[PDB]
Design a protein around this ligand. Structure first.
Ligand SMILES: *[C@@H]1O[C@H](CO)[C@@H](O[C@@H]2O[C@H](CO)[C@@H](O[C@@H]3O[C@H](CO)[C@@H](O)[C@H](O)[C@@H]3O)[C@H](O)[C@H]2NC(C)=O)[C@H](O)[C@H]1NC(C)=O
Ligand SMILES: *[C@@H]1O[C@H](CO)[C@@H](O)[C@H](O)[C@H]1NC(C)=O
Ligand SMILES: *[C@@H]1O[C@H](CO)[C@@H](O)[C@H](O)[C@H]1NC(C)=O
Lengths: 49, 203, 87, 87, 53
């Protein structure tokens, strides 16, 4: 839901960069950034259902 | 049908304003109807009249125009604006320019004045010398200086030899003429500049 | 006939009615406009058929504006830095 | 292939289609516009409810124009005179 | 309703011309649709083509 039309392009880019930098080890994403079906410890932090 | 034609008027009303905004943007100006401009009056404390000058002399630049939503009954666009604001320090709303004619006695004698503008907005007259001014809307100048009225001030005198007849006539922008003539074919005193107004066309 | 007045010292004064600003400094700013038709549709009472008559006008006006703009980027930092360019 | 023509003395002529005015003098004038909505209402047949729809538009347009004008006075006389300033 | 919507067209027609006048005034030009300009052609005698300039 953090990606929406109400924000500008630069705002969305900053959001995506910060979220990717927070939730990545090397080039692999955390389980918490995935939905509950994609990973056991998913919290839908990055993707949705 | 009436239900449709009632909503069509709002579409036309929006179309007019959107066209005006497009014209202003193509013209490197700012449409202040689409922008708030109320937040920057408090951040920098200026009078109501001083904000009008800031609004009037603003230049804009568009660096991206994009579309984000492309539904059949819904759309969304974005425009990136970069604009520059000019902050003033004085206004000088009442001005008079100085024209130097001099007198001839041939030898043409003209007094030299450092100042070029006279300001009568205040109770006392101010004498202003302007440098590197720009003529865009209101006159924009980087430096203006207050100087003394050729008193506490010194003014050089330059005299140049000139051959006869040496007549000079200058339009006065209100219909009169400024005449400086050594000879006198018309009923005009010689060697003294004069202001001439005529009821009909004469030579 | 003619009308006369003798200038005393050969100095005359012109009206010159334009103001003189005497700028102090120049500032630069950035802003985004965010044109959206849903707000206008909700404020009015469009009925799912005049909405398509509004999006068409908005689209054609915005395309006409976009046909003459080059879509570049505003420099903001330092030319030497490599991290911004890499990003 | 190429096409050729030898200029005789090295002088060529450009179209240059803009006119050349050669001004004589410049004049200045003043005038007042006096925008009024009663004349438009009387010419049309507004019915005491579309009149309010016209005054609203006139007011908003005139305010938009007035938001960027400084409201100064035009100099017309002589800087020395005290009576005009006193008045 | 038709009585109202007939008078709304005149309001729109006036709005267009008023917006054009505002643009011209902000642009340091003169809108000659709102001004007569016929009195000064007789005060200073000029041709029809010279008045356009
Ligand atoms: C165009 O502007 C110039 C500059 O103001 C006008 O010249 C000035 O006109 C005034 C008005 O008549 C003159 O004042 C008069 O002076 C006499 C003294 O000779 C005095 O007795 C009168 O009561 C009156 O105050 C003024 O002398 C004259 N010259 C200046 C100021 O240097 C000119 O008349 C204007 N032309 C038109 C067509 O309006
Ligand atoms: C010129 O002088 C005459 C009288 O000599 C006077 O009647 C006329 O009004 C004057 N014209 C001006 C001041 O424009
Ligand atoms: C150039 O010359 C050729 C023949 O030499 C001719 O057919 C052609 O029309 C010419 N091109 C021009 C005049 O533009």
């Amino acid at each position: 839901k953090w990606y929406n039309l109400q924000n500008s392009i630069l705002q969305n880019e900053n959001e995506l960069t910060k979220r990717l930098s927070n939730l990545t080890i090397g080039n692999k994403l955390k389980n918490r950034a995935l939905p509950y079906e994609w990973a056991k410890g998913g919290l839908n932090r990055l993707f949705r259902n | 049908d009436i239900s449709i034609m009632e909503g069509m008027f709002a579409v036309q009303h929006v179309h007019t304003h959107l066209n005006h905004l497009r014209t202003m943007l193509m013209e490197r100006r700012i449409d202040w109807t689409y922008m708030s401009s109320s937040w920057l009056q408090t951040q920098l404390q200026k009078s109501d009249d001083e904000m009008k000058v800031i609004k009037r002399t603003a230049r804009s630049l568009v660096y991206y125009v994009k579309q984000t939503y492309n539904s059949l009954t819904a759309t969304a666009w974005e425009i990136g604006l970069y604009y520059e604001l000019i902050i003033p320090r004085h206004i000088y709303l009442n001005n008079w320019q100085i024209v130097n004619i001099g007198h001839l006695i041939l030898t043409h004698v003209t007094l030299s004045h450092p100042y070029e503008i006279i300001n009568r907005e205040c109770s006392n007259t101010l004498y202003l010398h302007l440098e590197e001014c720009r003529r865009l809307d209101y006159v924009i100048c980087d430096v203006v200086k207050i100087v003394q009225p050729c008193g506490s001030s010194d003014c050089p005198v330059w005299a140049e030899p000139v051959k006869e007849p040496h007549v000079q006539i200058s339009p006065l922008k209100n219909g009169s003429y400024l005449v400086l003539a050594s000879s006198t074919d018309c009923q005009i005193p010689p060697y003294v500049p004069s202001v001439v107004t005529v009821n009909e066309t004469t030579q | 006939e003619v009308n006369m007045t003798s200038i005393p010292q050969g100095v005359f004064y012109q009206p010159h009615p334009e103001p003189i600003i005497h700028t102090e400094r120049v500032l630069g700013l950035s802003q985004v406009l965010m044109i959206n038709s849903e707000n206008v549709a909700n404020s009015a009472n469009l009925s799912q058929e005049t909405k398509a008559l509004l999006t068409e006008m908005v689209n054609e006006e915005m395309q006409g504006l976009s046909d003459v703009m080059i879509d570049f980027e505003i420099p903001l930092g330092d030319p030497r830095d490599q991290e911004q360019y890499i990003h």
